[PDB]
Amino acid sequence: SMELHRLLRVADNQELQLSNLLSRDRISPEGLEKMAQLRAELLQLYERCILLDIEFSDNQNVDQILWKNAFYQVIEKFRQLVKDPNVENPEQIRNRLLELLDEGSDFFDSLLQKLQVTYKFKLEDYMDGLAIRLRKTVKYALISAQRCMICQGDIARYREQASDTANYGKARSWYLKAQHIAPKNGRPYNQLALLAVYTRRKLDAVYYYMRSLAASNPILTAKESLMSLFEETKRKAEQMEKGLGSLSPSDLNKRFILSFLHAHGKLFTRIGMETFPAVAEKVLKEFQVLLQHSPSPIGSTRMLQLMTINMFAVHNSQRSVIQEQAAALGLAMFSLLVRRCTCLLKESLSSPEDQDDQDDIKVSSFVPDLKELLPSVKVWSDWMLGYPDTWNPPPTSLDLPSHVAVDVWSTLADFCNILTAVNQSEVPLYKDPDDDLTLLILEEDRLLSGFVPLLAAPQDPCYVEKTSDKVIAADCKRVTVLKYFLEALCGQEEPLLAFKGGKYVSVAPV
């Protein structure tokens, strides 16, 4: 304990010297030598601490301080010198920056191995949060390891920029591996959002910044980042403002993403909401057409990002008009998804009471266009069970300029009706583990792991035989979840759906 405090005591004084050296407008070749000397002592000091007592280190923020003092400060000073016209040999300074980055990459590669050796674990045994199984020291060593991976990403990104290139592929891989370690940390999403802005992937950038805000450890800076992004979107939408079934999938898609971001800008910035109803109708109209294209121009992964942003807007909205309008938009897009899923199902039937078991729709017969949409339908339905008071009673604040409404509850009743003819028993699902069984995790639940709003929906483990087809198994689980969802809505106190006169129907208000 006293040895640790002794180590940090030395470090702070080392840092005081480094900070002062860096304050200078220029750094002599003698100044650069001393800096190298200071950084090396710093690293040895910090690393010893980490490898002596990881929990102490975490509590003293040694990782954060290591990065800030020995790397961030220095890197940023170098970037400034290279651009200073007062600097006579900028290319030589660039070269020292590259060198420092490469030595940086080695340092963190080495520290990652040491963490594993010192605290006795392999990283690959902890990359699946959804694995049901932590020693207090391994908990903290994983936390630190995640920080090392974020540092590797930042180093890789710095390297690209120092080289006037933009192959951000390595940086992204480091951030993705960091997110896997601990999905509740907002920082990996924030850094991934930055990569998206560099590459002008606007929707991904908004998605990831929102992930960063809706994490257990949020990155508040993401707020300002989004304001700036949405300001830029507002401009581009207003600029593009100076039939749908005729456009190509690609053109319609590009148009849709812009409308969608425009609507969410208004919701996020709370500016220009007086014309939210018109942008919302535009979003829904375009979304409705994109759903009819085969294969989906949008795709499951993007669809899930859309659902995520919709859920975020509903929570970020606090029951105000704005919160009702966010919920209305989400519910409407959810409804159009379900409707399309219904068409798809019945493209593959008698009346409910008259359904014969030999005519049931087998899950293994699901067409690929249906399979692409079900993960998003399931995740939104999870969200709804999590926040029943946002949609029951239904929001009433959104009135589209055409006054044509989307009937969520009738659409859900129809879905319930076609679903009764679906047989999901091809792969039996079990509540309890067994030697012949194994854990079924859905790809969409993995993706959204860490998203705080979804922490309120059930997480009940699900087991299937090791011999079962895992694709069919996953869809049988989705169908079971949606059937339970629809049952839950029928069993609600003041229910919006009911089985009535031989079929499921809407009993929601006019």
Residue numbers in the entry: -581 to -580, 580 to 710, 714 to 822, 879 to 954, 964 to 993, 998 to 1159
Cite, word for word, the article reporting this structure.
A well-known example is nonsense-mediated mRNA decay (NMD), which detects and degrades mRNA transcripts containing a premature termination codon (PTC) [reviewed in (3–6)]. In turn, phosphorylated UPF1 recruits SMG5, SMG6 and SMG7. These three proteins share a phosphoserine-binding domain similar to that found in 14–3–3 proteins.
We found that SMG6 TPR was a monomer in solution and had no propensity for self-interaction. We obtained crystals of human SMG6 TPR that diffracted to 2.1 Å resolution and used SAD to solve the structure. SMG6 TPR features the typical 14–3–3 like domain (α-helices α1–α9, colored orange). It also has a C-terminal helical hairpins domain with seven α-helices (α10–α16, colored teal) that are stacked perpendicular to the 14–3–3-like domain. Additionally, the linker between the 14–3–3-like and the helical hairpins domain is longer in SMG6 than in SMG7 (68 residues in SMG6 as compared to 11 residues in SMG7). In the structure of human SMG6, an aspartic acid (Asp683) is present at the equivalent position and would be incompatible with the dimerization observed in SMG5–7 TPR.
